[PDB]
């Protein structure tokens, strides 16, 4: 499950 911290800042 990928992790979205902010706008344009999503991580595997």
């Amino acid at each position, epitope marked *: 499950k990928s*992790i*979205r*911290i*902010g*706008p344009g*800042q*999503a991580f595997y």
Partner: antibody
Amino acid sequence: QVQLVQSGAEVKKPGASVKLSCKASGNTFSIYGISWVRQAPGQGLEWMGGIIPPAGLTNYVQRFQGRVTITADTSTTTVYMELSSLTSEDTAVYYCAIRIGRGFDYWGQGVLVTVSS
Amino acid sequence: DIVMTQSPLSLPVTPGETASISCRSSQSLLDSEDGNTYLEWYLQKPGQSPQALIYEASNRASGVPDRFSGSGSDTDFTLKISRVEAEDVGIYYCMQTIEYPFTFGPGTKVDIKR
């Protein structure tokens, strides 16, 4: 899961600088971001900026004209916000809050910064 | 830059009834690529730190009971609180995270109607 503990209250003269801290403890996340949010007495919430320490990324608000600097110390798992050229209008409670994939899931207790002559 | 508005300013609720508060964004909060809508709701009880209620427009944060629910379009949002009780008194804020800078609505104050 996470607990965020903030430094203590600050009283400053106009033109001075203040450095606040936010220490995270509890569970560990490989990816997270810490933001600072302030609230002037009796007013609403205002987002000031944030950092994503694992990625080396920061985001700031233009209105603050570069007066805010956010830094992180990986070793002590602490995040700092330094606010320079203080004026009376920076008097507020400052919160730190953490994002780990949802919203601001956890918040610090706040710290009152009073700026006055 | 994205402007968030809320309605009403103040909302009295009788005990056990339902509170409904609204939020509007000046732009769509839909991220059409990952399909989520980035709208969050927070509660600040009197004298306390803000706390999370809703994220991605309709999902409840951990520990939030199911009597809190979020819904809406991509621009107009509703926080519904059923079975209102004294502990729900405080100010509710919406906040968008589709775009930097994050921006908050002005807050809606809920109190107990007598």
